[PDB]
């Protein structure tokens, strides 16, 4: 009762301004994504040139998938951390996450920085079409 009346005084809301981040934050997120995509390209080139060597207990396909997933997840986490650094005290997404009332830091990160890897059955989006994911992509494209 008493906290709801004080809330009548102070008030609480969620808006677009909570989702927006600083321009520097967006630039850093973009730079992180560029670096990650370039690193995934490098790993794919290593695999194509047969430089890659299988991790114990894993096939070359499985170790390549694990390395790519690790790079993508690390970039996603870094972008999320940058977005969370951007958050102000007044930010209401942060208010709800800090209070624990609703939401999580994952949700803030997806809202502000990067939605992240879409995975089905514990693997990246499968090659549903013949050796490709969608008809718009070229065959044998393992990029992000």
């Amino acid at each position: 009762t008493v906290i709801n009346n004080w809330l009548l005084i102070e008030g609480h809301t969620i808006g677009i301004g909570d989702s927006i981040a600083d321009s520097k934050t967006y630039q850093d997120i973009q730079n992180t994504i560029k670096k990650a995509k370039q690193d995934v390209i490098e790993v794919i080139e290593k695999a194509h040139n047969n430089e890659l060597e299988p991790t114990p207990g894993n096939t070359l396909r499985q170790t390549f998938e694990n390395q790519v997933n690790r790079i993508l997840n690390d970039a996603r986490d870094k972008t999320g951390s940058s977005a969370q650094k951007s958050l102000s005290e007044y930010n209401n997404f942060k208010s709800m996450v800090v209070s624990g009332a609703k939401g999580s830091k994952i949700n803030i990160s997806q809202v502000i920085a990067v939605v992240g890897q879409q995975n089905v059955e514990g693997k990246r989006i499968p090659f549903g079409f013949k050796h490709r994911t969608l008809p718009h992509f070229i065959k044998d494209d393992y990029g992000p």
């Binding site: 997933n69 996603r76 994952i106 992240g116 879409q118 995975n119 089905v120 693997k123 990246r124």
Partner: peptide, 8 residues
């Protein structure tokens, strides 16, 4: 929808 370690 997040990653391989998260949720779909």
């Amino acid at each position: 929808i997040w990653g391989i370690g998260c949720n779909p």
